[PDB]
Write a protein that binds this ligand. Structure first.
Ligand SMILES: Nc1nc2c(ncn2[C@@H]2O[C@H](COP(=O)(O)OP(=O)(O)OP(=O)(O)O)[C@@H](O)[C@H]2O)c(=O)[nH]1
Ligand SMILES: Nc1nc2c(ncn2[C@@H]2O[C@H](COP(=O)(O)OP(=O)(O)OP(=O)(O)O)[C@@H](O)[C@H]2O)c(=O)[nH]1
Ligand SMILES: Nc1nc2c(ncn2[C@@H]2O[C@H](COP(=O)(O)OP(=O)(O)O)[C@@H](O)[C@H]2O)c(=O)[nH]1
Ligand SMILES: Nc1nc2c(ncn2[C@@H]2O[C@H](COP(=O)(O)OP(=O)(O)O)[C@@H](O)[C@H]2O)c(=O)[nH]1
Ligand SMILES: [Mg+2]
Ligand SMILES: [Mg+2]
Lengths: 428, 129, 430, 427, 430
């Protein structure tokens, strides 16, 4: 369990993926040319989880950059850390997915999918001990959602024993590109329920609300939203890339987080909440675990119960104080944890804080309140599906209406399964 | 009330028993079995891996069927558009030629009538006085 | 790469094509001889020869040679190869039946052969952009015939129109309502998206905003070229946000028959005056009836989709703020089955104006494409004029004489009656 | 749609045809020898619609001059512009038609008709894109009426897809040559109803009344009547002869003007009314559209409704002012236009005024009031036919009485069809 | 000769082995390179000797992952061990018993057995095995149970003793540790002769209370565990008088095969940071205090079946007997009715040794009490309750089933630990 292969697909997938590589490169002391110029041994200890060592001291991200359109590839190449990526790892088509899940999953995506698998296969065969794959993508568009889910099932077929992990951006009318976002998102959730081991739900509804309500940004942009995503992704991957005891690899994390196979959708939490254009004690950080304002998925943790939680504290702080505050937070909020999974909160402390901060807290929650996110997508989906609006763009790609009804049923079953465990008592 | 009993004495040790009270009341695995159990677990693990791949093979077949279905629908659309247009162009051709034939037949009938008028003028003229 | 083939049909289609291709040349730095002294997205609209010459991916067709002869002998005579400028001898005499059958059938194979030669030069053809009036015999009848033949040779490949809706101020024929209903009926199942331009709306914009007493086709077509250029700027350039032929269709068309977006454009400022509008100001102008390309009342209807195409000095932050204030407008109503109806595209290249034209150079402009059920008002006006004449069978003998049957008139009108009911049903609450 | 082949038949047809050729030659800058000595490019732009280009820079009218008697053709050859015509295009007989439709249509006319077709075929076959044919003739005599209608059906048989257009002079007791004029006119109307696409009704009753009442000519001559006809013909062919958008060819005009195949008889209007030895404002010109005094057919436009109208304004004037005045004239007179043909009035403005004028207006009207012209012919016809007066003049030429009853029925049906559309509501 | 082979399994087993072997080297005068500048020759039970005069542990370090053992291969004692006794796979058991037992373990078990056989072949009087592992880890639980089974087949009449780490949430690495603990106890029960459980919470609290360590690390815990292990193995590695051979552990502490879990108590644990030396009476009194136990449980709620006192250092029999006489006077010390009330005492003259620079102070005398009490069933009850809470919902069970395990194995393992709880209850009746 050493190497992770990262894949980013479509516009959103490539924007949040480029930002992930730039934050973790800064934390690991790696400059835009792949050269290490840091001053801590902890920075290089597990550098090989995300980076390959190329000719003469340079480190190159084990990342494959995918799109059905070239513009996104060009903008990443032109971006701050664009030159760090392996040039032959950029795989792109010319046609685009036309914001259509069916085109990404069955038509244009199927024509480009073997070129992508040849590049991820080269990265995988080069691994001494491949852990699995991490995919960044949106669910509301065509390439990230349709082609990203096609890639997941193809990768599941060729690497059935590896962990499949996603950072999935959920659409919101508050930051919307296309009218068919609820269809593309429902068709992707159906794929994620069946084929991923861990999915981080990155909700644009929540990111917009943090920027507007807490950061007081009257008009948030994707840059403001992606600054919260990059801090969150740095926080959730902390135990994979620095020395530590807990959840040090994708499978140990899944075993600690996933009590039921379908219940693998995580609600990430982060404190402090910051803007790009610029405090915090241990008790203050631990409190944010139940604060809806600190969640990256638009769900209130107090509306459900945590099945499991991974709490990651970063910076120079007392491990003793963190241990005392984490016990107090659980004991004082016992009604928000299922009593039938004892010791379901695991804590880790890392000396290296995320880029731009001195102290932080990141919560990976498996909460039954995530059903609110799925219900919101489902109500938007049925409002369109009831009138069969825009259906001809999917049936014109060869799809049957039965796929829609099946994806909708699977997603409503997922909601109903979270509700079942939310109401379950220890005394059956 | 304590009975001491010397047990052993050695180079780097000494031992004894101390008795406070006497008691109230006076007084195979096999390699084959292990291998059988390990092989049965391996066959269950291989069976669920094969079921997973069988379902993924069914998804690949469905993917091929949707591509085929879109191709077949485009082909039926082409076939229908082609025969609807051939039918429309031919019906129009028959109609335009029918209108043109009818109006030429009317003009031809006028010519027959004119030679009949000419014949009557001729018998009135000359076959008189 | 991502090519678009333009087909300009009849006088209106050809004259609007003259204005569009003149403007694209100015926007890409292409001289009238095809030479150009990097973006490179213009390759979607221009092919290149071994001598570095840039040639429009376009065919200009007319059944009479007069209008296309001006292209063949004008400023841009070296821009197009002679084989892509196609004309017959006799026009369709304002008769759909002569465009579709009698005269059009004599030249349709030649036009298809030339389009096949342009398609053979495409590595990723997106589809076809067809420019024509609804009123002319060629614009109505030959376009319908061509659309049907394109569906046979290219199946479902995207076909989008720029169609001129008839206006009495500049109308050339009494039978234009007949030519419009027949062409809409025949074309409905073959077209993916049609951008209608009402000549009365452009005529009034020229009088009001540009101070032109009696606007000519030159005044109308230069303004139309500006709108067409805005719709195709996302395809011919690579800006902050792009939208291709496919993205237009997906976001603007909820049902195959409901494919007529309303076009609104701002700002239209006179070359005189000497007085810059903000992103919020030009965005607000898109929801004002005086800036629409089709006369209709969006307050009497509901929005199903809105696509904003910005160009020039425009930043995404300023666009999102403008759309957020539009979302809070009670007077701008959306259908209840539409949770989100906004597709934004931004290009860096400001709107270029023809030297010596009527339009002022502006720092930023926007073209809104909206699917509003209010556009059914334009169909209702046309259908009523059709009914007044058809009740008496007035002028029908001209079509019947060319092989058409009266049953085609009833079917075309019944199809447009179903289209009116489709807009009514689609605007209903769930 | 480029070339028009002109044919002029009989005395009247040749007199108005010679006058048409001299007015349009003057407007196009063409002198009596066919030489162009104009000044404007608009003059030559569409010169090929009416003229062929002969050896050297000369222009020769695409005109065939026909008569069963030689006299009018000798006077045409001797007249102003007589030498412009192609000498081999003069086709004439020696016998005459004795002001008898039957002689022109069936006897003498049939003997000369193949010599005429020889010449029109040569003209028509030489065209790059033939529009069709225009005939000038009277309806009250024998050659123009009888032979002119015979030529129409022969030319139709050979060119069924071309437009057939006529300038037909309707007889009147106010300027009459023969007692049988109502018979010759009814027999010709029967032919025109079935075989022409557009017919301009040039009424001698109206021409005489304009000269007598308005021009104060106590005793008008054919020269006085023909000056009004030449200005009217210059006005109605303006859009065929000069660059423009509207009704630029014979078929586009017919499609805009003719809603029902039989109702193709036009009432021409003209302003200002002048004599041979004599500028109005735009509002004054537009008013004359409803003035019975300005009609070249003796009908009152206020007695019926316009199915369609083509309004042609010539001279240096504001297109904006013409547009405003034409809207006002139809909004203020909405009851005189059929409401079930929307936007039925099409306007055109041409910078070149007709010869002798600075500003003019010409109206090509398809009005239901034209039924007054047909009723007048019909009442004269029945007063003679009821007593079978002069019938042996026609039956002596081989005709049957049945052709008279048929022509009469056809013409009364035409009246009854104009009345039907006049009373029709949109409902 | 009475050779003992040590087997260190998984991270906990390996890291505790580092602490134990570091301490044995200090106690026998063996340098980190295996040399000893030379007491008695009893150290040969734990160390073999090579042709170059080096002393090598009779030990195998095994892990399914290489990281922890790699520190042994490249650290201070890298020359103490031969590379063939440090065995690692590539991928660990991911905190899953089924993964370590059925999937991964199965591919490295023959290699480990081969190495054990090579160490056993160098013994003239092999006593048995001392196995170090955690209950909670996938390797410590799954691989250990698999290894115990094969060891019973290959070495039937040989003793097997365990030093097993009982899970504590303060340092817990996985939510499923109660599952792994019950599964490994069930499969190991019939193959183990005696298991000394060490509760991480008890050692964690002793480090905080007795050593003033705010947040104890594995280095702090293992150095304390190493003292206790050294105290128990002292009479095998030196010429002692009590627990002289491995069979004597079951004879002195285990009257029934299933009830083989003695409670370990140790004193004194003093911080390296002046202090008067504790007397025999003081360290003996500390033996009967719950705060000094290796497992959290209440000996008052149970009965003693056997008690072994292992004194070390400056200790005289007269003072031991006087100390035990006072304890009987003030305390009950209830023994089961079939066993006599009394103690088996052993004094090892070798002084307590501490790691230089560690957290423990050098003391003149220390004592380790090993008592088989029915109160240790409280630790099983706590573990069984956590198992039941999760198992009632089948939480995490899919991870084990996915590796080829059946749900029935969970029921069987839990039923076996329910029988173990009832055995402690029946045995403590009168
Ligand atoms: N905006 C605009 N409308 C035009 C232009 N030319 C013609 N139209 C309109 O188009 C209609 C007439 O159709 P045309 O395109 O001229 O006719 P056509 O397609 O050439 O057909 P035929 O001449 O009958 O063969 C009327 O509504 C005109 O106002 C132009 O350049 N611009
Ligand atoms: N006392 C002590 N306990 C430890 C140590 N390392 C791990 N543990 C405990 O052992 C349990 C986790 O099992 P590990 O031994 O780390 O796991 P493993 O045997 O390597 O198994 P996998 O990693 O799952 O293959 C938890 O209860 C830890 O607190 C150590 O050095 N000392
Ligand atoms: N957080 C975030 N969301 C984005 C970004 N770009 C696009 N999105 C969202 O992604 C969805 C559109 O999908 P997109 O990735 O652009 O389409 P694709 O290229 O077809 O995969 C919508 O929900 C957008 O709000 C980005 O940079 N950040
Ligand atoms: N306006 C006009 N009417 C004429 C002229 N010559 C004859 N007519 C009329 O034409 C009719 C007689 O026909 P005419 O052409 O002379 O006989 P044809 O030679 O047999 O055709 C009568 O109605 C005359 O009033 C003329 O030059 N001008
Ligand atoms: Mg035309
Ligand atoms: Mg481990």
């Amino acid at each position: 369990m050493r190497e992770i292969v990262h894949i980013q697909a479509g516009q959103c997938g490539n924007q949040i993926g480029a930002k992930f590589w730039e934050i973790i490169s800064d934390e690991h002391g790696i400059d835009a040319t792949g050269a290490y110029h840091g001053d801590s041994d902890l920075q290089l200890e597990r550098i090989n989880v995300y980076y390959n060592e190329a000719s003469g001291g340079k480190y190159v991200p084990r990342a494959v950059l995918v799109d059905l359109e070239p513009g996104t590839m060009d903008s990443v190449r032109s971006g701050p850390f664009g030159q760090i990526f392996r040039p032959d790892n950029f795989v792109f088509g010319q046609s685009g997915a036309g914001n259509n899940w069916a085109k990404g999953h069955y038509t244009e995506g199927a024509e480009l999918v073997d070129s992508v698998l040849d590049v991820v296969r080269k990265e995988a065969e080069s691994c001494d001990c491949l852990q699995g794959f991490q995919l960044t993508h949106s669910l509301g568009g065509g390439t990230g959602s349709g082609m990203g889910t096609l890639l997941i099932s193809k990768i599941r077929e060729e690497y059935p024993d590896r962990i499949m992990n996603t950072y999935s951006v959920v659409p919101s009318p508050k930051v919307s590109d296309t009218v068919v976002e609820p269809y593309n998102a429902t068709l992707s959730v159906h794929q994620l329920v069946e084929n991923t081991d861990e999915t981080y739900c990155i909700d644009n509804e929540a990111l917009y609300d943090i920027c507007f309500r807490t950061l007081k940004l009257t008009t948030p942009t994707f840059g403001d939203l992606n600054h919260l995503v990059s801090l969150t992704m740095s926080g959730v991957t902390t135990c994979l890339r620095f020395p530590g005891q807990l959840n040090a690899d994708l499978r140990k994390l899944a075993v600690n987080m996933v009590p039921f196979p379908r219940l693998h959708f995580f609600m990430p939490g982060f404190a402090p909440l910051t803007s790009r254009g610029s405090a915090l004690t241990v008790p203050e950080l631990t409190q944010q675990m139940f604060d809806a304002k600190n969640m990256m998925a638009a769900c209130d943790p107090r509306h459900g119960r945590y099945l499991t939680v991974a709490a990651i504290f970063r910076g120079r702080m007392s491990m003793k104080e963190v241990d005392e505050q984490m016990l107090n937070i659980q004991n004082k909020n016992s009604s928000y944890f299922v009593e039938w999974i004892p010791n379901n909160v695991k804590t880790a402390v890392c000396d290296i804080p995320p880029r731009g901060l001195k102290m932080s807290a990141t919560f990976i929650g498996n909460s039954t309140a995530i059903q609110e996110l799925f219900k919101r997508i489902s109500e938007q989906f049925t409002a369109m599906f009831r009138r069969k609006a825009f259906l001809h763009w999917y049936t014109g790609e060869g799809m049957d209406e039965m796929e829609f009804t099946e994806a909708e049923s699977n997603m409503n079953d997922l909601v109903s399964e979270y509700q079942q465990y939310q109401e379950a008592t220890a005394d059956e | 009330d304590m009975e001491v009993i010397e047990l052993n004495k050695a180079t780097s040790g000494q031992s004894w028993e101390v008795i406070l009270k006497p008691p109230s009341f006076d007084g195979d695995p096999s390699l084959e079995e292990i291998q059988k159990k390990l092989e049965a677990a391996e066959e269950r693990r291989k069976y669920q891996e094969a079921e997973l791949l069988k379902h993924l093979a069914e998804k690949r077949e469905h993917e091929r069927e949707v591509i085929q279905k879109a191709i077949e629908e485009n082909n039926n659309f082409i076939k229908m558009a082609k025969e609807k247009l051939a039918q429309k162009m031919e019906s129009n051709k028959e109609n335009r030629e029918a209108h043109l034939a009818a109006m030429l037949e009317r003009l031809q009938e006028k010519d027959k009538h004119a030679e009949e008028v000419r014949k009557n003028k001729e018998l009135k003229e000359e076959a008189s006085r | 790469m991502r090519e678009c083939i333009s087909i300009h049909v009849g006088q209106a289609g050809v004259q609007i094509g003259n204005a569009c291709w003149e403007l694209y040349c100015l926007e890409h730095g292409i001289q009238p001889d095809g030479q150009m002294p990097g973006d490179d997205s213009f390759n979607t609209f221009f092919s290149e020869t071994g001598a570095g010459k840039h040639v429009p991916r376009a065919v200009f067709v007319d059944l009479e040679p007069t209008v296309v002869d001006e292209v063949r002998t004008g400023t841009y005579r070296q821009l197009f190869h002679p084989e892509q400028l196609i004309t017959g001898k006799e026009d369709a005499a304002n008769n759909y039946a002569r465009g579709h059958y009698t005269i059009g059938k004599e030249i349709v194979d030649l036009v298809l052969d030339r389009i096949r030669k342009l398609a053979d030069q495409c590595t990723g053809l997106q589809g076809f952009l067809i420019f024509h009036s609804f009123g002319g015999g060629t614009g109505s009848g030959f376009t319908s015939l061509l659309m049907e033949r394109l569906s046979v040779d290219y199946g479902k490949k995207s076909k989008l129109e720029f169609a001129i809706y008839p206006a009495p101020q500049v109308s050339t024929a009494v039978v234009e309502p007949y030519n419009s209903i027949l062409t809409t009926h025949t074309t409905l199942e073959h077209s993916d998206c049609a951008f209608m331009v009402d000549n009365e709306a452009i005529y009034d914009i020229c009088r009001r905003n540009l101070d032109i007493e009696r606007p000519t086709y030159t005044n109308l077509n230069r303004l139309i070229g500006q709108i067409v250029s805005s719709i195709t700027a996302s395809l011919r350039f690579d800006g902050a946000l792009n939208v291709d032929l496919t993205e237009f269709q997906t976001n603007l068309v909820p049902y195959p028959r409901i494919h007529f977006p309303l076009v609104t454009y701002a700002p239209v400022i006179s070359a005189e005056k000497a007085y810059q509008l903000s992103v919020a100001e030009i965005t607000n102008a898109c929801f004002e009836p005086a800036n629409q390309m089709v006369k209709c009342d969006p307050r009497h209807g509901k929005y199903m989709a809105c696509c904003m195409l910005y160009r020039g000095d425009v930043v995404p932050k300023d666009v999102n703020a403008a759309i957020a204030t539009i979302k809070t407008k009670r007077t701008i109503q959306f259908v209840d089955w539409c949770p989100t109806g906004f597709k934004v595209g931004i290009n860096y290249q400001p709107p270029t104006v023809v030297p010596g034209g009527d339009l002022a150079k502006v720092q930023r402009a926007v073209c809104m494409l909206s699917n509003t059920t209010a556009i059914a008002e334009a169909w209702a006006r046309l259908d009523h004029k059709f009914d007044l004449m058809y009740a008496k069978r007035a002028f029908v003998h001209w079509y019947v004489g060319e092989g058409m049957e009266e049953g085609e008139f009833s079917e075309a009108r019944e199809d447009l009656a179903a289209l009116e009911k489709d807009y009514e049903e689609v605007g209903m609450d769930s």
